[PDB]
C-alpha cells in the first residue's frame, strides 16, 4: 500500500542517517580526552537551606542576578527567595495546587507557572498597587505543562503532555508557533544561550531541536533507552545533555548529530530528574531517584562528587548564571544551596 | 541599606506568618485523588456527594478535596507522580462490564506496585452492583468465560449478603472483591492497604465510607509509626 511504501522509505532514510553517523564516528570522546587532567575530588557542602514549603517541590529557576530564585510546590504556592539572606520576597498562592513547572523571566519582572490545569499563568512582580497578582494566563493545551522558559518579557515557550510544545505571545495570548512531532509526553525544554533555538525531551526516548523563529524541527536524536526527564545545554550552545529513566546521562552534539558520551555507573539503577552544566561546562550535575545528586566529569565520564543531603526524591536543580552556586529542590519540601 | 534589610526582614515576617496560617489550613485538609476508567460511574459518585476537576465535601467537621483529572490524555504514567502524597486514592471499577475488568486489574496492579505510590492506600468502589446482579441473574454473559478461576471459586465464609441477595450475586461480587485483594495483599507489606466496598449509583452513604476509611488509614499509619501494628 501507499502506507507500506512510506514505511519502507522511512526505514531507508533511517538507515541512511545511521550510516552518516557511523561515518562520523572515527573516534570516541574518551579517547580524545584521555590525556586531559582529571578535575579532582569535588566535595561541595550545603551553604544555605531554604525552608517554608509545605509540599514536594517540582520546579525552580535562578534569576539573572544570581540572587533571587523562584520555587514551586504542590501546596499551591510559588515562593521567591533571596538566596543570600534566606528571606522570602513573595509567596504567590496558585489557583491550582498541582503545579509542575515554574520559570523566572530574565528581566525579573515576571514569573510563570503551570501544571495539571493545562494553563500557563504569568505573574507580574513589578505591580503598581503593592502585591504580585495574576497578569496573563495562556490557554490552549490539552495536556499537562511540564516545562516553560521565557525568551523575553512578551515571548514564552511551553512544553506539554499533549506531546506538543508551543511558542506564545504573552500580550495577545495567542500561540504564535506550534511544535508537533513528539509521540510521547514532552517533559523538558532548554533554550539556547542566544534564544535562537531550543530542544525538547519527550517520553518517546527522543530529543528534538526546534528553530524558534521558523517553527520547524531541525534535528531529532534517539539515544536514550527510556523516557527523557531533563535536558540542559552546554554553555557553548552546540551541545546538550539529557537524563532519562534508564539511569544514564547522555551528551549529544548538534553539529555532529550523534551521542558523544554516556554517564552511568552500575550501582545507579534509578532514573534522573534534573540535569545542568557548570559555568564552563566541565561539570555535569544530575539529580537521581536515589536521593543523591551526582557530579560527573563531562569530559572523562568520571564522577567527581556526590550531594547526599535530601531526604526524598530530588526533583530539580539549577546553576546560577554567574556560576557561584547550584541550588537543588527535592520532594522533602526543602531547597539547598551547594557552593 | 540596612533599612532595606529591615524591610526585607519584616516582609519575610509577614510572609512566614501567612505561610503559618496556610500551614494550619493545609494540615487539616484531606486531599483525595479519584481514579478509574470512564463509563464506570465516576461522575455519579461526585453527583451524589454534591465532570468537574474538583470536589469539596465535609464529613463530621473534616474537610476533603477530591480530584479527578479530565483533560489529561490516557498516558497516566508521568502525571501519576503528582499524587504520591495524597491521603487516599479512590479507585472506581465496573463490576458489570465484565470485558473491562482485566483493564481495571492491570491499572490496579500498576498503581499498587508503583515505585512512587508504595504508601498510598486505595479505597476500591465496585460500582454498578445492580447491573451486575442483572447480568448474573440473566445468565447470558457468565464470568467463567472471562475469568475461568470463577468456576472453582468458593463464596467466602466472611461474606455478608444483603437480605434476599441471590447466592450467585453474592459469589460474583465477592469473586471480583477477592480478585482485587489477591493483588493488594501480594505486595502491600503493611505500608498501605486496600478497602473494598460494594456501592451502587443511588447509594447516598459514600462520603461516610470515605470518612471511615481515611480514619482507618490514619489509624494504621500511626499504629505502624509506633511499631505496634
Amino acid at each position, epitope marked *: 500500500s501507499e502506507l507500506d511504501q512510506l*514505511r519502507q522509505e522511512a526505514e531507508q532514510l*533511517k538507515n541512511q542517517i545511521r550510516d552518516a553517523r557511523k561515518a562520523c564516528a572515527d573516534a570516541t570522546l574518551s579517547q580524545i580526552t584521555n590525556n586531559i587532567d582529571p578535575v579532582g575530588r569535588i566535595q561541595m557542602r550545603t551553604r544555605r537551606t531554604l525552608r517554608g514549603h509545605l509540599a514536594k517541590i517540582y520546579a525552580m529557576h535562578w534569576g539573572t542576578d544570581s540572587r533571587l530564585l523562584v520555587s514551586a510546590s504542590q501546596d499551591g504556592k510559588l515562593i521567591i527567595w533571596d538566596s543570600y539572606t534566606t528571606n522570602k520576597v513573595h509567596a504567590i498562592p496558585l489557583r491550582s495546587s498541582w503545579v509542575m513547572t515554574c520559570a523566572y523571566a530574565p528581566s525579573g519582572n515576571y514569573v510563570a507557572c503551570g501544571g495539571l490545569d493545562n494553563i500557563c499563568s504569568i505573574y507580574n512582580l513589578k505591580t503598581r498597587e503593592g502585591n504580585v497578582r495574576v497578569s496573563r494566563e495562556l490557554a490552549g493545551h490539552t495536556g499537562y505543562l511540564s516545562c516553560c522558559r521565557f525568551l523575553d518579557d512578551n515571548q514564552i515557550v511551553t512544553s506539554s503532555g499533549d*506531546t506538543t510544545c508551543a511558542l506564545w505571545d504573552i500580550e495577545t495570548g495567542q500561540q504564535t508557533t506550534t511544535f508537533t512531532g513528539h*509521540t*510521547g509526553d514532552v517533559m523538558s525544554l532548554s533554550l539556547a544561550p542566544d534564544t535562537r533555538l531550543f530542544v525538547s525531551g*519527550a*517520553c*518517546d*526516548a527522543s530529543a528534538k531541536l526546534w528553530d524558534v523563529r521558523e517553527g520547524m524541527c531541525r534535528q531529532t536524536f*534517539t539515544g536514550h*533507552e*527510556s*523516557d527523557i526527564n531533563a535536558i540542559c545545554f552546554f554553555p557553548n550552545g552546540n551541545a546538550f545533555a539529557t537524563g532519562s*529513566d*534508564d*539511569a544514564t546521562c547522555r551528551l549529544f552534539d548538534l553539529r555532529a548529530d550523534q551521542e558523544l558520551m554516556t554517564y552511568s555507573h552500575d550501582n545507579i*539503577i534509578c*532514573g534522573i530528574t534534573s540535569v545542568s552544566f557548570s559555568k564552563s561546562g566541565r561539570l555535569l550535575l544530575a539529580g537521581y531517584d536515589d536521593f543523591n545528586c551526582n557530579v560527573w566529569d563531562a569530559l572523562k565520564a568520571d564522577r567527581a562528587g556526590v550531594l547526599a543531603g535530601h531526604d526524598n526524591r530530588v526533583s530539580c536543580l539549577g546553576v546560577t548564571d554567574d556560576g557561584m552556586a547550584v541550588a537543588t529542590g527535592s520532594w522533602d519540601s526543602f531547597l539547598k544551596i551547594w557552593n | 541599606q540596612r533599612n532595606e534589610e529591615k524591610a526585607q526582614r519584616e516582609a519575610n515576617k509577614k510572609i512566614e506568618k501567612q505561610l503559618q496560617k496556610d500551614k494550619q489550613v493545609y494540615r487539616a485538609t484531606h486531599r483525595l485523588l479519584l481514579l478509574g476508567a470512564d463509563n464506570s460511574g465516576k461522575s455519579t459518585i461526585v453527583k451524589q456527594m454534591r465532570g468537574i476537576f474538583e470536589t469539596k465535601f465535609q464529613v463530621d467537621k473534616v474537610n476533603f478535596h477530591m480530584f479527578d483529572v479530565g483533560g489529561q490524555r*490516557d*498516558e*497516566r*504514567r508521568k502525571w501519576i507522580q503528582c499524587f504520591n502524597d495524597v491521603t487516599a486514592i479512590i479507585f472506581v471499577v465496573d463490576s458489570s462490564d465484565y470485558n473491562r475488568l*482485566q*483493564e481495571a486489574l*492491570n*491499572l490496579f*496492579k*500498576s*498503581i*499498587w*506496585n*508503583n*515505585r512512587w505510590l508504595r504508601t498510598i492506600s486505595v479505597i476500591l468502589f465496585l460500582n454498578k452492583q445492580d447491573l451486575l446482579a442483572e447480568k448474573v441473574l440473566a445468565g447470558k454473559s457468565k464470568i467463567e*468465560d*472471562y*475469568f*475461568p*478461576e470463577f468456576a472453582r471459586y468458593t463464596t467466602p465464609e466472611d461474606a455478608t449478603p444483603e437480605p434476599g441477595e441471590d447466592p450467585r450475586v453474592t459469589r460474583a461480587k465477592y469473586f471480583i472483591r477477592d480478585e482485587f485483594l489477591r493483588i493488594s495483599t501480594a*505486595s502491600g507489606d503493611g505500608r498501605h492497604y486496600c478497602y473494598p466496598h460494594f456501592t451502587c449509583a443511588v447509594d447516598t452513604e459514600n462520603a461516610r465510607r470515605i470518612f471511615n476509611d481515611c480514619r482507618d488509614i490514619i489509624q494504621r499509619m500511626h499504629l505502624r509509626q509506633y511499631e505496634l501494628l
Partner: nanobody, 128 residues
C-alpha cells in the same frame, strides 16, 4: 533507537498453532518487563500476556489462559508467544510492548493511541 519488530502470524484455521517472535534492539532486554497486547478489529487494545525480568513471573488474560504461552530469550534478545487452540475471536493485531522503565513491576503500556515503546503489528486471522 528503541526498535521493535514482531513477526509471525497469518491465515490459520481454528484450532491451529502460531509462533510470534518479537526482536528488540536499542535497549537491554533483561532489564525490562514485557507484554503481548492484541487489538481486535473495531475495538480498543487489550492486554494479553505479561512476563518478568527473568521469566519468573508470568500472567495471562483469562481468555488466553491455558492456551497461550510467553517466553524470553535474553541471550538472543527475543520475546516468544506460542499461540495454541486458536478461536475466531482471537483474530487481532499483535504487539510486543515494553514497560517504560527498568527494574519495575508496574507499567502503563495499553495506551489507546500512541505508546512509544510499541511494535508495528502482525495482524493474525483465524477463520474457517
Amino acid at each position: 533507537q528503541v526498535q521493535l519488530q514482531e513477526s509471525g502470524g497469518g491465515l490459520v484455521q481454528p484450532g491451529g498453532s502460531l509462533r510470534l517472535s518479537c526482536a528488540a534492539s536499542g535497549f537491554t532486554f533483561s532489564n525490562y518487563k514485557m507484554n503481548w497486547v492484541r487489538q481486535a478489529p473495531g475495538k480498543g487494545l487489550e492486554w494479553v500476556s505479561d512476563i518478568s525480568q527473568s521469566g519468573a513471573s508470568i500472567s495471562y488474560t483469562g481468555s488466553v489462559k491455558g492456551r497461550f504461552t510467553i517466553s524470553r530469550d535474553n541471550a538472543k534478545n527475543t520475546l516468544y508467544l506460542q499461540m495454541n487452540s486458536l478461536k475466531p475471536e482471537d483474530t487481532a493485531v499483535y504487539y510486543c510492548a515494553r514497560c517504560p522503565a527498568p527494574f519495575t513491576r508496574d507499567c502503563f503500556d495499553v495506551t489507546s493511541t500512541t505508546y512509544a515503546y510499541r511494535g508495528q503489528g502482525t495482524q493474525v486471522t483465524v477463520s474457517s
